[PDB]
Structure formats: structure tokens, C-alpha cells
């Protein structure tokens, strides 16, 4: 669905205005100093992501800026942007709903969650609502398989969802508020629902089990 060739358009072209704010230039200076001198190209992924956080997406002008700041050919920045899926090369809604659909989440009825969002928002997979508020896509495993059907909005994981719960998150996001992240089924973490089965005794303090030699 996402083309990997850039054709200039009025809203996306080399003349589209982008430049890091003075605050971000200070952040870039700390990033570029995490790597050995003579390997500034190592900062493409962080800085290119920092551009997206400021701007919400990456226009062709944003990529060209990161290329000159780091002194790498612009093509080597285009390769990174097109390779990685967290970079948005087209505008997205301020709330990017990402529903995991890999098998462990699929076995626990992640199709119902997908249907719930499509009905509530009235959009199909890959579309943006006609208010620039929500964008919906399917994504691969997000690292929360032990949790029942889960989604990611921007930076937060909403886990153990049900068709009822996910609709509430959209409602809570719709008006003004940021829903609390995490499981929505009475759990707090990967813990087994129905009572813990391990780690039920006071943790042993410093110096326990230490061998004589050390």
C-alpha cells in the first residue's frame, strides 16, 4: 500500500519548510556524541526519528535536512526512511492506532478488536478518519503476546483489550484525555490472572547466596 518512490507534490517537496527547533538542535548534539568520532552517520536513525516527533511525519525536506546535518548523501537517508516501518512518509492522524494481528494475538481474537475500531471510527484498515484524528493499520508482534489483543497508540500499549474496552479508549482519546496505558482486565503486567503462581515470598536481600570466594 505504501509506495517507495517519491513524486513531488505541493505538500511534499524539497521546498516544504522544515527545520529543527533550537531545542532539538541541542538534543541532536547529544545524540551525535553517543558515537565514535568519524561515525556521525550512526545518528541517522535517532535524528530522523527526532524529526518525526517534532513534525509528526517525514517530508522529503525533513530527510534532506538530516542528510546535511550529519553530512551523509541524501539517498542514504531515503534508504533508512523507506526500510523502517515506524517512519511515516505520509501524514498520519495525531492518534496512530496500531492493532497487532500476528498469530498469538490472532488466536485471542484480535479480529474482534479490529472490527470494533472500524465500526466505531467508520474507517477501513490503512485509512485516516475525515478529521485528521485517527489512522488505523495492522502491525506485527509488538512484544506483548502474553497479553490478550493489544494495540499501540503513538507510544502507549493498551493490553488485554475487548471490543468494549477498545471503544472506551477511542472515546477517552476523542474528547481530551490520554487513557492509562497497560492491561484493561484487572491485571497489571504479564502476571497470571487469577493469582500469582510464583514470587510470593519476600525477596532475599543483599548478600544472599553469595559464594565464599567472591
Amino acid at each position: 500500500g505504501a509506495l517507495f518512490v517519491h513524486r513531488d507534490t505541493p505538500e511534499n517537496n524539497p521546498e516544504t519548510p522544515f527545520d529543527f527547533t533550537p531545542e532539538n538542535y541541542k538534543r541532536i548534539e547529544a545524540i551525535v556524541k553517543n558515537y565514535p568520532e568519524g561515525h556521525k552517520a550512526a545518528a541517522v536513525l535517532p535524528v530522523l526519528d527526532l524529526a518525526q516527533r517534532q513534525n509528526g511525519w517525514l517530508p522529503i525536506s525533513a530527510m534532506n535536512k538530516v542528510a546535511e546535518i550529519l553530512q551523509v548523501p541524501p539517498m542514504r537517508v531515503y534508504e533508512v526512511a523507506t526500510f523502517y516501518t515506524m517512519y511515516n512518509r505520509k501524514p498520519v492522524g495525531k492518534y496512530h492506532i496500531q492493532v497487532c494481528t500476528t498469530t498469538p494475538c490472532m488466536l485471542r481474537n484480535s479480529d474482534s478488536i479490529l472490527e470494533a475500531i472500524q465500526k466505531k471510527l467508520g474507517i477501513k484498515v490503512g485509512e485516516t478518519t475525515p478529521d485528521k484524528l485517527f489512522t488505523l493499520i495492522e502491525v506485527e508482534c509488538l512484544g506483548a503476546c502474553v497479553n490478550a489483543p493489544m494495540v499501540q497508540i503513538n507510544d502507549n500499549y493498551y493490553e488485554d483489550l475487548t471490543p468494549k474496552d477498545i471503544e472506551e479508549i477511542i472515546d477517552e482519546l476523542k474528547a481530551g484525555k490520554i487513557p492509562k496505558p497497560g492491561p484493561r482486565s484487572g491485571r497489571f503486567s504479564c502476571e497470571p490472572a487469577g493469582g500469582l503462581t510464583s514470587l510470593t515470598e519476600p525477596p532475599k536481600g543483599p548478600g544472599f547466596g553469595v559464594q565464599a570466594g567472591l
Binding site: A30, I31, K33, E37, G38, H39, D155, P181, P202
Partner: protein, 44 residues
């Protein structure tokens, strides 16, 4: 002293978009000086 009914990891509820980089910037004062290959870039 054995309270285990509370999720003691709630700081992340308030993290913002620039939280990660702000911590990275604050850590620049502790870093040891970086190594140098000997050139400004492989293309030099």
C-alpha cells in the same frame, strides 16, 4: 513490608514524546570521551 498488591511501576504514565531524548541529553555530562577513528568520516 511485603506489599505485593500494588503495581509499583507507574512513572511511565506521564512520559511524553521528548522524555527519552531529554534523559539522553542529561546523560551527556557523565559520558567518557568518545574514541576517534582518525578521520571526520569514511568519505574524507
Amino acid at each position: 513490608p511485603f506489599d505485593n498488591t500494588t503495581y509499583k511501576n507507574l512513572q511511565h504514565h506521564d512520559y511524553s514524546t521528548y522524555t527519552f531524548l531529554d534523559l539522553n541529553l542529561d546523560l551527556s555530562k557523565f559520558r567518557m570521551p568518545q574514541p576517534s577513528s582518525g578521520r571526520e568520516s569514511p568519505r574524507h
